[PDB]
Symmetry: C4
Subunit: 196 residues, 4 copies
């Protein structure tokens, strides 16, 4: 077994790195099953020449809404769960990671099917926050996924390969995704159906 | 659909901004229903020429009290829930936001009606904390709402409009509020009544 | 009603302050009832000439212990709950505050009576952490309470008084405490007794 | 009773310290019972000549996996619970500490027995994060434990001794461990067995 991180803390990625260049999120996001739960996932990249300490990820849902009392909220924000409750939003970014938001009863996508999706008017803001080790300072990097940019029933291509006691990232594959069998029911719908 | 945040992370607000000037909270706060829950809301502004990273909001209730054992606490503090449990207190401040505190059993306003309000001796301290991107440093901004400054049964006027592929903020409307039909019972009272 | 914090964020404490000097905890800590719950409380002071942003408080229990399997832990640490779950450990330090730890089933003092106390071999480490506004940097301040320094059945004297539209702190009273009727049973004991 | 931390905040460790040198984790990690729960523990050292403020610890499990739907995740990460929920991951590092992760239903080691262990292909990444008081800046220190480096049924040797009103650390013992009677069943197995 070849290690990912060595005893002294130095990682075994990007052979001959030196741990501005900017961080990248995948251009699209995907939705598909993982151990029987429907998930939304987007890929967040790393920085080729330094770690990001106290790194964390969050997401906001931007969607205008009307409260049952007629109050209309343009571009309302609501937090999307991507690990906050278990500290899985506290990232160890040393290679591109697939962030996953399980679509459960408390997710805003709970009632959105595949057909329902391209009709909805919404945007997901993805915000990475950490301290650039080398730089000393607090960075923030943002990106955005609009409806048309969320691909139902796809999955992210892997980019990680072990080569000669070092792990290397084929950054070409970063944004690439492939298709997989995926039900077109809504999370909610899937849940009711399984519940009988 | 015109985006709020572009793929590269640059927002589409305040056409031709350059992302000291000071942040502003609304002068008053309002109380009114949102999807059948009574809420207290105050508006928190943004900074016209920079983001605030790791931005977060909290509120303290200042009200002198007497413990059942006679211990009198002058200006006692207790935390007001404004998203802490779900990370909705972690703000993405790129335009004035309405912060909302749902008045539930664990809120201090649970037993305060409309008539009861102007009688109570209390103050809400609102504290924004984040890192000014441009400046590098940790800022804090504070404000305060006393009883007379909490308007029962009102709502905040919207200030957000889409113009020419950019969203613009009519800062005149920032502090302005309007009236809406709102029961004058206390949260607690409303709850009991609905519970039968 | 005279405000504690003004609309522009400036507080109304310490008339003519300018918002190194060091922060002070009370020399002793006290234990006594608050709304029918037994509490341990110590007082944490403020800094006369600046705020402390992102201020937070925590406490550690240092007590050597033996695991049921004979493993002996010298000076074992375990966290004492002082608001962590509700964000009441996130302080708004603009005048000396009484920090309170409710002694419940999950507290380490759950089974410690008044008589039992002076026999136990333990220490409470109190750690304040925040960013000194003026200084720019992250401070930490520590103190410690050993058994003999925890006064059962006392309460903290108030130090806060309103004078001429400003609130002033009689720093003489800071460490002073007085006595109050307080049962000498353990929290656990009190609980069982009330439970019948 | 000789104190660990003095009233003024100065600790009573490392007689004549001055509160780069690098922090050290133990070379191995151990698994063994503590009050009837099976735990995984590794030791994290302190820094001989300065405190680490806002110090915190986290751990990641790196293990490649296949989702029930065939999606294969190379070097998947998942957070290991080491105090996050109760703030026991917020460390008071003034002498080497044994960090403990209780192996419960939500731990990834729930179904891993002693025999099962050396077969599994996994790695634990341990990440300390804090602010070096003297330095002003945010540090991160990392280490790693692979299967062969996790010793089933051992415990950490104590290194802490009281000498002349000061506590001293025999840094020789730091990495040393000894054996203890320890069941070779999996946590899960132990649980089922006790549940009847
Ligand atoms: Ba920080």
């Amino acid at each position: 077994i070849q290690r990912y991180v060595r005893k002294d803390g130095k990682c075994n990625v990007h052979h001959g790195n030196v741990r501005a260049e900017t961080l990248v999120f995948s251009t699209h996001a995907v939705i598909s099953m993982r151990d029987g739960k429907l998930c939304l996932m987007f890929r967040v990249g790393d920085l080729r020449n330094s770690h990001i300490v106290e790194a964390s990820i969050r997401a906001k849902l931007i969607k205008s809404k009307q409260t049952s009392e007629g109050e209309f909220i343009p571009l309302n924000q609501t937090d999307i769960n991507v690990g906050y409750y278990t500290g899985d939003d506290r990232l160890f970014l040393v290679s591109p990671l697939i962030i996953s938001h399980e679509i459960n009863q408390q997710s805003p996508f709970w009632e959105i099917s595949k057909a329902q999706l391209p009709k909805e008017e919404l945007e997901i803001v993805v915000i990475l926050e950490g301290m650039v080790e080398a730089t000393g300072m607090t960075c923030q990097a943002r990106s955005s996924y609009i409806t048309s940019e969320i691909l139902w029933g796809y999955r992210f291509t892997p980019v990680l390969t072990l080569e000669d006691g070092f792990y290397e990232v084929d950054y070409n594959s970063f944004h690439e995704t492939y298709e997989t069998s995926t039900p077109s029911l809504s999370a909610k719908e899937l849940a009711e159906l399984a519940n009988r």
